[PDB]
Amino acid sequence: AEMPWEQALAIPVLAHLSSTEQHKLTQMAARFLQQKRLVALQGLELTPLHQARIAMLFCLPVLELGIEWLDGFHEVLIYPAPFGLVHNQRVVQQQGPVVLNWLDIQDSFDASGFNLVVHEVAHKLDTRNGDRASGVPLIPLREVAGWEHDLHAAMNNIQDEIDLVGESAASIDAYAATDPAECFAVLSEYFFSAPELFAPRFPALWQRFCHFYRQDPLARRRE
Ligand SMILES: [Cl-]
Ligand SMILES: [Cl-]
Ligand SMILES: [Zn+2]
């Protein structure tokens, strides 16, 4: 009968939401499931708990933006397992389904920095204008120059760290230095899953993300 929403919420990435935020996320996730299909492929079977959690992850980055920011897709295709040279090629080609895999979704529940759902949502936010993926989501025109400035500076800063300490030890996943679209998506993963690594390191860009997402995940870890 009922979806197991309360249980669904009990995962690390969602653990610091206020009770208000948890109830609002639950309503949006319920609406998500009304409006979009989660299509499990190749024999994968997703339980109501899994379905509920996946919906809530999709809704997290748009909690204060609204479900209409996810209008760029009708379906989500979920493979059991993973199959990013072709990934980024695909990214910069848009109404297509979001494509995920279950192994990476399960990792997306923890508070590690990695979140494939948030990553893919970020790409949809970047292209919501109908524009090609540029690492810049829908923001006022006067801010674009400054956004791109701060984004590209962060990308070079990530490359500098990779050159100094190596890929394995780098503070932000090295994939962020790939290109601006990937930088936005990877830093969006940190914004929600590991804000403590983002905010101190890129204060100007952090402020821009807070204002764009209308959320402050670091402050939320305070009460
Ligand atoms: Cl269940
Ligand atoms: Cl968090
Ligand atoms: Zn990507």
From Swiss-Prot:
Q: Where in the cell is it found?
A: Cytoplasm
| Keyword Metal-binding in annotation | yes
The catalytic activity of this protein is classed by the Enzyme Commission as 3.4.11.-
Q: Which gene encodes it?
A: mtfA
This protein's record includes keyword Cell inner membrane: no
Q: Which GO terms describe its biological process?
A: proteolysis
Q: Which UniProt keywords apply?
A: Aminopeptidase, Cytoplasm, Hydrolase, Metal-binding, Metalloprotease, Protease, Zinc
What HAMAP family would the database entry show?
A: MtfA
**What species was this sequence derived from?**
Klebsiella pneumoniae subsp. pneumoniae (strain ATCC 700721 / MGH 78578)
The main place the protein resides is cytoplasm
Binding of Zn(2+), residues? H87, H119, H123, E182
Q: Name one GO cellular component term.
A: cytosol
Function, as annotated, reads:
Involved in the modulation of the activity of the glucose-phosphotransferase system (glucose-PTS). Interacts with the transcriptional repressor Mlc, preventing its interaction with DNA and leading to the modulation of expression of genes regulated by Mlc, including ptsG, which encodes the PTS system glucose-specific EIICB component. Shows zinc-dependent metallopeptidase activity. In vitro, can cleave several artificial substrates. The highest activity is observed for L-alanine fused to 4-nitroanilide (L-alanine-pNA). Shows lower activity towards proline-pNA and valine-pNA.
The protein's matches in NCBIfam families, at most eight in alphabetical order, are given as: PRK15410.1
In what way is its activity controlled? Association between Mlc and MtfA may induce structural changes that activate the peptidase activity of MtfA while inactivating the DNA-binding ability of Mlc. The aminopeptidase activity is partially inhibited by metal chelators such as EDTA and phenantroline, but not by inhibitors for serine-, aspartyl-, or cysteine-proteases.
Return the domain comment text from this UniProt entry: Zinc induces structural changes at the active site. The holoenzyme adopts a self-inhibited conformation and is most likely not productive.
**According to the UniProt record, which cysteines are disulfide-bonded?**
none
Protein name in the entry: Mlc titration factor A
Self-association and partners:
Monomer in solution. Interacts with Mlc.
